[PDB]
Amino acid sequence: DYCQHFVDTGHRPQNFIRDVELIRLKDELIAKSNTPPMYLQADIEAFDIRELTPKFDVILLEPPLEEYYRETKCWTWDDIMKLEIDEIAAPRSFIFLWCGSGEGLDLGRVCLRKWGYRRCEDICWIKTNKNNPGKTKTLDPKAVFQRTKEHCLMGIKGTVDIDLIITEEPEIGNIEKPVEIFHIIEHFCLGRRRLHLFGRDSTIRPGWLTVGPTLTNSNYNAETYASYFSAPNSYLTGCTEEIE
Amino acid sequence: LFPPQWICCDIRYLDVSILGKFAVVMADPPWDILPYGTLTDDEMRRLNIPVLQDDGFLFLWVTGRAMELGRECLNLWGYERVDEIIWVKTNQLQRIIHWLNHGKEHCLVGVKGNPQGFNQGLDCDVIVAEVRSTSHKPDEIYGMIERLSPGTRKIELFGRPHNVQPNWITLGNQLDGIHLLDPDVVARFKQRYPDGII
Numbered sequence: 171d172y173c174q175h176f177v178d179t180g181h182r183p184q185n186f187i188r189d190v191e192l193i194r195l196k197d198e199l200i201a202k203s204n205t206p207p208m209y210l211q212a213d214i215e216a217f218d219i220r221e222l223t224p225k226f227d228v229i230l231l232e233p234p235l236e237e238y239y240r241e242t243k244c245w246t247w248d249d250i251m252k253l254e255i256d257e258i259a260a261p262r263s264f265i266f267l268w269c270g271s272g273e274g275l276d277l278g279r280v281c282l283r284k285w286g287y288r289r290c291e292d293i294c295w296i297k298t299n300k301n302n303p304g305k306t307k308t309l310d311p312k313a314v315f316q317r318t319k320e321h322c323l324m325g326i327k328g329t330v331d332i333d334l335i336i337t338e339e340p341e342i343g344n345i346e347k348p349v350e351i352f353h354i355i356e357h358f359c360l361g362r363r364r365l366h367l368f369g370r371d372s373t374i375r376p377g378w379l380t381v382g383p384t385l386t387n388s389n390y391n392a393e394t395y396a397s398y399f400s401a402p403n404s405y406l407t408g409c410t411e412e413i414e
Numbered sequence: 415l416f417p418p419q420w421i422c423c424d425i426r427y428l429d430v431s432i433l434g435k436f437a438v439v440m441a442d443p444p445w446d447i448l449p450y451g452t453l454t455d456d457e458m459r460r461l462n463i464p465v466l467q468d469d470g471f472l473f474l475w476v477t478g479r480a481m482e483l484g485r486e487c488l489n490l491w492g493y494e495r496v497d498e499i500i501w502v503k504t505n506q507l508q509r510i511i512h513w514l515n516h517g518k519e520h521c522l523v524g525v526k527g528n529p530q531g532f533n534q535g536l537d538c539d540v541i542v543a544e545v546r547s548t549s550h551k552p553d554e555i556y557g558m559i560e561r562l563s564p565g566t567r568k569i570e571l572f573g574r575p576h577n578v579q580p581n582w583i584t585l586g587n588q589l590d591g592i593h594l595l596d597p598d599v600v601a602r603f604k605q606r607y608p609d610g611i612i
């Protein structure tokens with residue numbers, strides 16, 4: 171009973187999971203297929219989303235939740251729900267939305283439906299506290315338990331990996347989400363137009379367009395970005411060879 | 415009456431008013447998402463959960479599309495979802511067992527009213543435990559619920575024999591008859607069902 175063990179010693183039960191076919195070709199093929207990284211500083215509240223073209227195969231959306239600053243502009247779910255995500259999503263596409271562990275698990279589902287997706291996967295980031303068993307968690311008022319995880323919801327609209335990411339809890343006020351989310355996405359092979367909304371300089375990455383308020387440089391150009399997907403490349407999964 | 419109690423029945427037709435109020439309700443419904451007796455979405459919406467509690471917690475296991483439906487029932491029945499437990503399914507070596515392989519099961523936590531004297535914060539929202547039989551929930555949930563609300567009345571819906579626990583009244587259709595020891599319950603049962611039949 172690792173739950174009683176946590177009540178005894180302060181080690182979250184996930185601390186005790188151990189370990190937490192060569193799909194190396196996939197990864198290499200992904201990396202050969204990746205567009206150059208593109209990125210754009212944009213103050214998203216005040217930024218008309220439609221300027222972001224063409225329509226995206228995958229959207230990863232990482233809005234800065236107030237709860238992410240326990241001891242430290244936060245976006246409310248009110249703000250997030252008003253983003254016009256459907257206007258830049260492709261008719262068949264996927265969204266990955268980080269929801270935290272509070273009201274976001276509900277309001278995030280409203281967003282997914284609002285924008286036209288159905289949830290097909292709920293991915294959990296389980297945070298181990300192996301390097302600080304003696305650190306109690308200041309709880310949300312509505313909380314009943316100590317919250318030790320965050321959810322990333324996967325939405326689909328239109329016609330190898332587990333649903334768990336286990337890493338150590340980041341230092342207080344580090345809001346970075348595990349890079350593993352990117353591996354989980356890329357391995358799906360959902361297409362090459364990939365947008366990461368509210369990314370940072372630290373999250374820029376081949377095969378991805380990053381838009382966020384804190385980016386220090388931009389290189390984004392719609393016509394250039396579109397050229398990477400003009401024929402004969404429009405329908406690639408990102409998991410196949412380059413067309414010669 | 416502290417020791418286990420149970421009632422073989424169909425929650426659709428049982429008159430749950432005879433059971434009184436509980437600090438914690440747990441359910442693990444057979445959502446239509448059929449290898450066993452399934453309930454429809456309307457049948458799930460119509461369950462008379464609201465009479466079961468005035469101030470307390472609901473623990474509601476979900477899966478697949480019930481993750482959304484279960485949130486609907488939770489809200490319909492008058493609860494606010496204030497936590498969500500996941501159970502990480504390991505083996506004996508403590509390694510993890512549609513689009514992704516599912517290493518986990520979800521249990522929604524709902525609150526109703528103004529429950530007081532509970533020990534919020536004792537456990538954390540992750541369970542790591544070995545898989546017993548198919549469709550079995552992990553026993554850790556009962557220890558978590560007991561530390562949260564010790565000594566109080568608790569009811570489980572859609573249980574099976576192994577689910578019977580002290581301080582708990584289990585309702586299930588595959589159970590061994592009726593076994594009740596709380597006097598107030600035994601009374602209201604005889605009144606409502608003089609010849610033992612629903």
Ligand SMILES: CC1(C)CCN(Cc2ccc(N3CC(=O)NC4(CCN(c5nc(Cl)nc6[nH]ccc56)CC4)C3)cc2)CC1
Pocket residue numbers: 423424425426442443444445450451452453475476477519549550551552571572573574585586587588
């Ligand atoms: C993985 C989990 C932790 C989370 C998800 N879930 C899924 C699941 C799997 C199986 C079942 N079921 C298997 C089974 O064989 N029986 C029931 C259904 C019939 N049942 C009734 N009980 C009452 Cl009171 N009224 C009723 N009306 C009609 C029926 C009925 C008694 C229990 C239990 C329930 C849920 C598993 C754990």
